[PDB]
Design a protein around this ligand. Structure first.
Ligand SMILES: *[C@@](O)(c1nccs1)[C@H](CCCNC(=N)N)NC(=O)[C@@H](NC(N)=O)C(C)C
Length: 237
């Protein structure tokens, strides 16, 4: 997260940190708890990942320093990538992690509500991006979970900033015209939570962008509301 600040512990209880044990344990991507055995994250996060056996999901984390060899984690039973996904910049950048065990909800770890198809008219004005990603282009994974409030931008506006791409209605963008605040490397798969009517909604999933926090270059997110049916199909055994 560029231009953000340190989060308060338990502020974003749906936020989880995806870790890879190969070669040595490390932060891979972000993710969101959406059900007791389900993490919603980005498909492109699993590039090169041949098996879920090398994955560990940590919930209720503020500082990466909380994570050691003796820290409890959730194993991943299955990675579910959208069948139409080919590359973040192409859309369909969404995936589910089915956990080997169930998450015991608590003040530090609970699920975020998915947006409803009815809410596609809602004008979210209170939206935040969070993660342990880079604070700058050439940085490193951050110890403390960061947060930044970022305004949504219309798809038409976003398309203007990415004339080499196709910003579909399955994408959603957010950023300041002048830049300064944005997600960055390592935040991928993280949630774009927007507080509407005293209720947090998972509006987007951090996906890609040209650089980080650059002016006239808003971050691009998966438009979650467009995948509610897909999520329900893959989440139902
Ligand atoms: C993700 O955190 C990661 N993806 C793979 C490893 S870390 C990056 C988030 C970038 C967010 N940028 C922004 N809001 N401006 N995602 C990426 O780096 C993707 N590429 C780009 N060019 O963003 C990924 C497809 C390589």
């Amino acid at each position: 997260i560029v231009g953000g600040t340190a989060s308060v512990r338990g502020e974003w209880p749906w936020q989880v940190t995806l870790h890879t044990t190969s070669p040595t344990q490390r932060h891979l991507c972000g993710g969101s708890i959406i059900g007791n055995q389900w993490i919603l994250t980005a498909a492109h996060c699993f590039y090169g990942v041949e098996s879920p056996k090398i994955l560990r999901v940590y919930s209720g984390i503020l500082n990466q320093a909380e994570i050691a060899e003796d820290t409890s984690f959730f194993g991943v039973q299955e990675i579910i990538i959208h069948d139409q996904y080919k590359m973040a910049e192409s859309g369909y950048d969404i995936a589910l992690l089915k956990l080997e065990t169930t998450v015991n909800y608590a003040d530090s770890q609970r699920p975020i509500s998915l947006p409803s198809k009815g809410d596609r008219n809602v004008i979210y004005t209170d939206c935040w991006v969070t993660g342990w990603g880079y604070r700058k282009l050439r940085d490193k994974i951050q110890n403390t979970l960061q947060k930044a409030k970022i305004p949504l931008v219309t798809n038409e506006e976003c398309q203007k900033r990415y004339r080499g791409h196709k910003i579909t209605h399955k994408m959603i963008c957010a950023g300041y015209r002048e830049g300064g605040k944005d997600a960055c490397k390592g935040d991928s798969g993280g949630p774009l939570s927007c507080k509407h009517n005293e209720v947090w909604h998972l509006v987007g999933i951090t996906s890609w962008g040209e650089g980080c926090a650059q002016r006239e270059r808003p971050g691009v997110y998966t438009n979650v509301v467009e995948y509610v049916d897909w999520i329900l199909e893959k989440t139902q055994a």
